Every structure is written in C-alpha cells, then in structure tokens.
Design a protein around this ligand. Structure first.
Ligand SMILES: [Ag+]
Length: 128
C-alpha cells in the first residue's frame, strides 16, 4: 500500500506481520495500529515502536521502567525513530514519519514495549 501499512496486535500478544517494506520513493511512511480482541490497555496494551536493531534492547528496558502512563516509553528517547501510543482492544492509533530518517545498510526493528511482549511482538522494517 502506497507508503502505509495497517497492523493489528491481538489478545494473544501477536502482531499480524513480522516484516515491513518501506519504498524508497515514499516521502513519509504511516503505520495504522489497531487491537482486535477484548482486553484492556493495562493488561494487553500494544504500541508500535521503531528503532535500529542495535537500539531495541535499551528502548525496551527503559520503556518497561517508564510505566503505563508514559506508554512504556522513555520520554524524548533519541533512539526511537517513530512510535504510536499504547492502545487497548477496540482502539486505534497512527504514526507518520519522514522516510529520510532511514538509511540503507542499517537494520531496523519494530516492536511493542509493553512489559514482556517484545519477545513475541517484533519484526523487521526494511527500506526497499
Ligand atoms: Ag504489546
């Protein structure tokens, strides 16, 4: 889809994709996140967070420590290229970012920073 992707996080701690392609032609890229199921944000909250593969662990650790009210993200974290809000079932949130913030030769990971979820809820994002 021309410069966007729609992604779901379910009540079983799964995103419905593990690989996102971003066409070099896109000026901006948008992620539209939703949450099928019935579980509340405090129990099964999902976000979509983007960093380099190298930065992922530091982002997830500091995010766990940040707490629910900060959407499990360290405020002003320089390693986070883009992120949605944390959402519960029935909710939706989108993020758009400048594709110029990605370069070739660099590995990107997307993931959710809700406590313990990133073991399951992660994937690659590839400039193509
Ligand atoms: Ag999650």
């Amino acid at each position: 889809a021309e410069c966007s992707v729609d992604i779901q996080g379910n009540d079983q701690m799964q995103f419905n994709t593990n690989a996102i392609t971003v066409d070099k032609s896109c000026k901006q890229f948008t992620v539209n996140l939703s949450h099928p199921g019935n579980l509340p944000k405090n129990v099964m909250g999902h976000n979509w967070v983007l960093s380099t593969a190298a930065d992922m662990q530091g982002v997830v650790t500091d995010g766990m420590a940040s707490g629910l009210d900060k959407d499990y993200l360290k405020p002003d974290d320089s390693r986070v290229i883009a992120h949605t809000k944390l959402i519960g079932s029935g909710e939706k949130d989108s993020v758009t970012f400048d594709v110029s913030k990605l370069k070739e030769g660099e590995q990107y990971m997307f993931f959710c920073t809700f406590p313990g979820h990133s073991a399951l809820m992660k994937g690659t994002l590839t400039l193509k």
